[PDB]
Amino acid sequence: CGYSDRVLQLTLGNSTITTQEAANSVVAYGRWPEYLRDSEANPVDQPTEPDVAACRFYTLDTVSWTKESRGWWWKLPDALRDMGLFGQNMYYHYLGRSGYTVHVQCNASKFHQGALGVFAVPEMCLAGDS
Amino acid sequence: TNPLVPSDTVQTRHVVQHRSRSESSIESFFARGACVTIMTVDNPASTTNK
């Protein structure tokens, strides 16, 4: 019937991503995102859950890969702090939890070469300049 | 004293509580050896007048 590892469609809220050249997709540590369970709950107040207004695809500024490029990094939720109603909900509440679908995009041509390592690191503490 | 809990004045979610008051029981509060005095004694030379 035609279906494939390489051809995917993702839809969240008012946003859809298509790809004709994927290498399957990864679910970190085998765990899909979930809301906080009552047995593991800690703040007692009724939570705010924005659903489609915040759980949707925000596209960040495009960077450029060149022969000089040593590498790029981002932190979550920080990269999304100014993104629509997600950022607003984040800055109005003391506490927040969130999972993410990260989709990195980089096409080229059958005559280009190169390989990007895309790593999702829990608690990615970086070293300082001093 | 007014016996209120959070759900009486705010909208609350369901939380399954696991905390306990075990360490604040009267036994637990006092279950420790406390210093109540320091006694001084000696054993001098046979000669010393004191």
Curated annotation (Swiss-Prot), chain A:
Localization (cell): Virion; Host cytoplasm
Coiled-coil spans in chain: none
Assembly, per entry: Interacts with capsid protein VP1 and capsid protein VP3 in the mature capsid.
Entry protein name: Capsid protein VP2
Function: Forms an icosahedral capsid of pseudo T=3 symmetry with capsid proteins VP1 and VP3. The capsid is 300 Angstroms in diameter, composed of 60 copies of each capsid protein and enclosing the viral positive strand RNA genome.
Portion of the parent chain present: 76 to 205 of 2209
Organism placement in taxonomy: Viruses, Riboviria, Orthornavirae, Pisuviricota, Pisoniviricetes
